Ligand binder design. Structure first.
Ligand SMILES: [Ca+2]
Length: 214
């Protein structure tokens, strides 16, 4: 890994820690194009991701990613996801083929269709299917909450406001990855996310991020 512990309050946009995806679509289930203009800072000290439309039936989305790689340790995010059918707001670690490594990823994803729930998942050497849906007891879209994952060699623990919500112990990822955040509308996954209805603009806000090395 190339990165160390850090605390990001989002008082400004630190180009030394982050970079914006721009000018391309992930393809597959992503029905939008990443644009640097879709990642911006608010006056209230927050990073905001947006889902907008530049023309008929075309969508623009946002993705923020870290410059360095991070390994084992505690990952915390204080955020508020977007609320709307057919979309996803997330916080995850990622590394893959493009980077010349196995596909190792750990996720925290909010299905816009129902913000009273949260989904946890992970990929190890490209193998996923570890989805775990948890009831939050509140509407994540209404206020800020702290979401976290403790990534250790033999286990992954997920928390909501300090409370342990789920643990994973098999086929734990090992490759350090970049910290990422995104907001997007899907296609071909109606059963999972619901059918996107074209409503824009939509926003996901990030208050602060923290990574504490092992
Ligand atoms: Ca802040």
């Amino acid at each position: 890994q190339t990165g160390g512990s850090f605390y990001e309050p989002f008082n400004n946009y630190n180009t030394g820690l982050w970079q914006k995806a721009d000018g391309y679509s992930n393809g597959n289930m992503f029905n939008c194009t990443w644009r640097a203009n879709n990642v911006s800072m608010t006056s209230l000290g927050e990073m905001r991701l947006s889902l907008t439309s530049p023309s008929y039936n075309k969508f623009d989305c946002g993705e923020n990613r870290s410059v360095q790689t991070y390994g084992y340790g505690l990952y915390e995010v204080n955020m508020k996801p977007a609320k709307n059918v057919g979309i996803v707001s997330s916080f995850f670690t990622y590394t893959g083929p493009t980077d010349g490594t196995p596909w190792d990823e750990i996720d925290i994803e909010f299905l816009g269709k129902d913000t009273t729930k949260v989904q946890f998942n992970y990929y190890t050497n490209g193998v996923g299917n570890h989805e775990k849906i948890v009831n939050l007891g509140f509407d994540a879209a209404n206020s800020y909450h702290t979401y976290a994952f403790d990534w250790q060699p033999n286990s992954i623990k997920w928390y909501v406001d300090g409370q342990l919500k789920h643990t994973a112990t098999t086929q734990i990822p090992q490759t350090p990855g970049k910290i990422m955040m995104n907001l997007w509308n899907g296609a071909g996954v109606d059963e999972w996310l619901g059918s996107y209805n074209g409503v824009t603009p939509l926003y996901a806000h990030y208050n602060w991020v923290r990574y504490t090395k092992r």
